[model samples]
Target chain A: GEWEIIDIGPFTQNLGKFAVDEENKIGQYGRLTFNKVIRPCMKKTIYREIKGYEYQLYVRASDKLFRADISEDYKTRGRKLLRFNGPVPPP
Target chain B: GEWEIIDIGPFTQNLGKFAVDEENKIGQYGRLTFNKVIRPCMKKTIYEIKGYEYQLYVRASDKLFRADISEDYKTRGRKLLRFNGPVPPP
Candidate 1:
């Protein structure tokens, strides 16, 4: 297996405020970070769908929590979707 | 994050026979393979433990059985020991 990490954000406005966490803090609390894993080959892209690929989006204030949403587009199929309203974390 | 693939075995005589699996097939069977994932940087090695590092071992014994390791090294117990006699098909 091969892996690649893609950095999604370090937005100056504090995207974490818009994010929901277990503690439910609001407005500019934590650090926002994102990461993704491309498996089997490094050529895999966020625009393409490949088996065994993984990605993560989270915010870190005291601990990490899922971001607002995550998705992937498969040119042949459709989009893979995930959304978070609370503290729900990635597996 | 960076990723690397490390091939562990293509062992002849079928190491899968020695491995246990859900299907319970003994002797020579499917393809034996291994792979690992390194995060942030590719310098991570199997001998040294690190956070966000993952290691996987697969032996095709009737079906794929996996032994996996994932976590931070310093806080690890039992040298990150894991053995799955009946892992989900990989």
Candidate 2:
């Protein structure tokens, strides 16, 4: 229901994901897990995440899931996540 | 591969859609059909559009497809289509 721009290193797509200090860092809006990171495979895939009251979307230039050489190169690269936006005033 | 902000009144969710002058208006990045419009029902449904090499995504506060009273009210309201953004510097 709301939109914000935040940096997410890697996260799970678990629908029932809950917050724990281990997963939800103190300063971050962490809603998913810190482990079991499941990104899509191959060229491009859109991901959907849903927690109790939060919703998230993820996209990658190339998934390259099993290709650790290419996968590790993607962490915090020039390619950034596109977060949602808030609404404008009525016309 | 690119993102843009443009106005879309009503459109079909047809994946096999192609461009027609009746569909693709002049000065517009028209790619879909003008007739046989189809939107999702209930509150939220994320749409995916793909053509030759062009892609699009659509969202609404409330699809309100069958609710003409609410549907007609949404023609062009505060609920604007959320065109994707261009990436920032590296």
Candidate 3:
């Protein structure tokens, strides 16, 4: 069976403490950090989910948590936020 | 379009406290408990990895972490004990 997206972060546009210093760069920086750091760590965990055929999980933070939407074919659903290609090999 | 086998647990044969009561059943129970319980939680995280084509992330416990080997040079590599047919759907 092929893998598919089952959820994503409740990513906020409003930068947290890390983004405060360079407010204008928050969006870009957050996207880069999440894509580079957070997403990879999460992959190890979700790889098991698809293997197990489990459906969903809650992504929580300080005071709130949101249910990440899932789709059978992530390509149709993932759009801008989800990705399928690996980053360039490090130099 | 198809999924492939990756890493399995750094499973310890010595079962932790939960496995102590039924000593003889540790292997079977650990396999079941890890597969049925622990593995599922990890799947969600991995799907994103394969999707993003990421290599590795250090899964730290308390004292140590290893450099997860990756295949895509930039991506991490993984291996597995077993799998293929989707678990009989609930």
Candidate 4:
């Protein structure tokens, strides 16, 4: 799982307070608690296969019903959607 | 109250026009105003909670939501939804 920065605004606390653990590189201070407050408000489960692969259903961000179709080649075909890098590495 | 950059789109003007108070430590200069008049349009008072604090939200870039927690440490707890800081600091 990965985390993302949501907002940056004015406050009286150390905005970089979480950086304390980074200085050590042990990666444990706030890492354990690293998740949104939405955990308790959601549920997850896995269902059996329809043809040859498994099917699963989960709640969406708005707490609405969501479904997905997956296959072994799912990750390969979805590469375009996951291109977060700025560029393809300045070769 | 506090300010933030709302949109850094394509505009023509002195984007840095408000830096009149700064100089070579001397007086002022409109020396570096941009020809593309870019402007920022932002909303005020995004969130508020009594007995705690208020969140002055700011969305300066495309697909991002920034929040400033006043008189509270909640500002230290901003969990960006989609876009993150690579934009600018608040």
**Which candidate comes out best when scored by DockQ?**
1
Write down the TM-score of model 2's second chain.
0.18
lDDT of 4 by residue, B1-51 (tens): 222233434321111222111221222222322122122232222334212
Report the poorest 10 consecutive residues by lDDT, candidate 1 chain B: B35-44
By TM-score, highest first, what's the ranking?
1, 3, 4, 2
Model 2 per-residue lDDT tens digits across residues B36-84 = 2221111221234221121222222221111111112223222222222
In angstroms, give how far residue A43 of model 4 lies from its true place: 27
Query: Which is superior by lDDT, 2 or 3?
Result: 3
Candidate 4: where is the Cα deviation over 4 Å? A1-15, A23-91, B1-4, B9-15, B20-90
Q: Which has the better DockQ: candidate 1, or candidate 4?
A: 1
Q: What's the true lDDT of residue A46 in model 4?
A: 21
Name the top lDDT candidate: 1
Worst 10 residues of 2 chain B by lDDT: B62-71
Residue-level error in angstroms, candidate 4, position B41: 10
Better candidate by DockQ, 3 or 4: 3
User: Per-prediction TM-score, please?
Assistant: 0.29, 0.19, 0.21, 0.20
Write down the DockQ of candidate 2: 0.06
Chain B TM-score per candidate, please: 0.30, 0.18, 0.16, 0.19
Each prediction's whole-model lDDT (CA): 0.34, 0.23, 0.24, 0.22
Candidate 3 lDDT by residue in tens digits, B39-59: 222222233245322111222
Off by over 4 Å in 1: A1-71, A74-77, A81-91, B1-3, B7-54, B69-80, B85-90
Q: Score the docking of each candidate (DockQ).
A: 0.12, 0.06, 0.06, 0.03
Question: Who wins the TM-score comparison?
Answer: 1
Off by over 4 Å in 3: A1-57, A66-69, A78-91, B1-38, B41-90
- Best-to-worst lDDT order: 1, 3, 2, 4
